[PDB]
Amino acid sequence: QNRDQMRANVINEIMSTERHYIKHLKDICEGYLKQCRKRRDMFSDEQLKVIFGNIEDIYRFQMGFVRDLEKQYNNDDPHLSEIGPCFLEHQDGFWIYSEYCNNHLDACMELSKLMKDSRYQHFFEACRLLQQMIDIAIDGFLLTPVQKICKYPLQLAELLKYTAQDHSDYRYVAAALAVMRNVTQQINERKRRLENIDKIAQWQASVLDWEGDDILDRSSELIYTGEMAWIYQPYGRNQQRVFFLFDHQMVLCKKDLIRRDILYYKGRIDMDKYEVIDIEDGRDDDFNVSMKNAFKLHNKETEEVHLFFAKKLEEKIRWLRAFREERKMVQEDEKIG
Template identity: 70%
Template sequence: MGAVEGPRVSHSGNAAPVLSTSHAHWQFQIYSEYCNNHPNACMELSRLTKVNKYVYFFEACRLLQKMIDISLDGFLLTPVQKICKYPLQLAELLKYTNPQHRDFKDVEAALNAMKNVARLINERKRRLENIDKIAQWQSSIEDWEGEDVLVRSSELIYSGELAKISHPQAKSQQRMFFLFDHQLVCCKKDLLRRDILYYKSRINMDDMEILDVEDGKDKDFNISVKNAFKLHCRDTEEVHIFCAKKPEQKQRWLKAFENERRQVQLDQETGFSITEVQKKQAMLNASKPYYDFLMRQKHPTLPTTLPQQQVFMLAEPKRKPSNFWQNISRLTPFRK
């Protein structure tokens, strides 16, 4: 083997900088798909292992490939564990790297990139869970018309009650509005049962410009308004005016419109999208009586911080329930 060599000076070269680029998002997108599909894969495997021919087949494959004696669900867990380990390993490497070392900045950048990948995977998991809730919400709306919300949207940004005024009548109508990415859905409350909503219309937010309106007489509509803002269509010059009951409600809506545009831009930058299969499955689940059972299933959550070995557990962390969906459930009770 020759003489024992002294300690080597190891340089990361271009390995770490590759992770620090924006390409890390799409390079690791397959992990996002895999982690979010992992619960379904385990459920399907559990179903198949109840049939002897599949049990024999899986074992024969393992023996032919001379693989270690681990069950198939253990192999399925490996990619999830790996994406969890990357930040831990890089953090440990950074801990023992001298800040003056030429590799320090590259390792630090790689660590931040892998943390971002974990955050993106968790965000995608949350968004995929949301599409089931959105599909269930839509199924509770009476007289729904046109395409499903999920055709263009995957996130509820904000919701609330506003007075809507449109040309040519300039008549005020009290409506419930639900702001999703790309669209604003308008619903009307039932006169007798106020917890039932009827679909009325929707507005394409991609074509809209949001304008703040001062209290007083509006020139376009020739009426006095308070706590108002406008949605102006750049293409058709169509204008809608909306009035909130309180100034703080108006400000929350203006902030929500900013968040909606920010969400759309972020989805474009990260390449986030919902597949047609996922959309159809969500709508199918919304119409099934075992919807609540599906929503209770656990999903793997990846660490965005750096805990110890607990990160390898697939238990979902406890979270406070979202007020959004509690409010919506009161307004539009899910059908049995």
């Protein structure tokens, strides 16, 4: 015991937070959603869609989950409850949080936007006053499922700690811990980083004179970007461009001479066909120039060669690190698929 009891504490706490959480879901879908649907004159279809997301779906799933959990609860002996199986058979269901975790910041945006009108303020205040919730604004209550999907592996780790190796629930609790950890990280990497993938499309559209395929055809991450001087070929003329490095390719633009916030597409490089040669200080061979803070890009199959100058040394280092970064990313992406 006091270990064989601790587990009973963990089980009971989990059950608690689940009942409270499903109650918060109820107070959300009944207290806020319903009333906003009732008032077309204040909330569009688009507005509702942005603010609440798939929360009704979430509630619908949580109901069944908590239901099976209560089925698995042992009243004669709480710490005997076998609850791993529950998480395991509903392991797919949790992916509906992905969506919710994606459109959350947008919900915070529209909420902050609608918190400027006293109408919506008094309305929300009233709604929260009817459903008997705590004095937390709606933006707070809208964070609870992001919290809850993050809390799960924390609660599973604790349950495992006070689970005996011979417990019929041991392997299931373990497996489920692995599962929820996986889920949380998948949510995270997919939403955050692949919506980083989203915004580069915006940037691309901001660019003028676009030549070639869309960048998102081969790439999917902005590594580094900076202004550097460069020379396309030996005896070439020095040009001031702005470089954008992505996985597989590096696009370069020219800044308008007057409207500085304007970019004209000037070409791209296939990094899968180029190696980075770090050039030391001093004097170059034909080519044939003098150098400080400089490096070079060499074609693997061709004798093609390009010259690059940063301004500072910090930038030479940042850039070299950015190329190493790019190669590591290519290797890792092709390895993971």
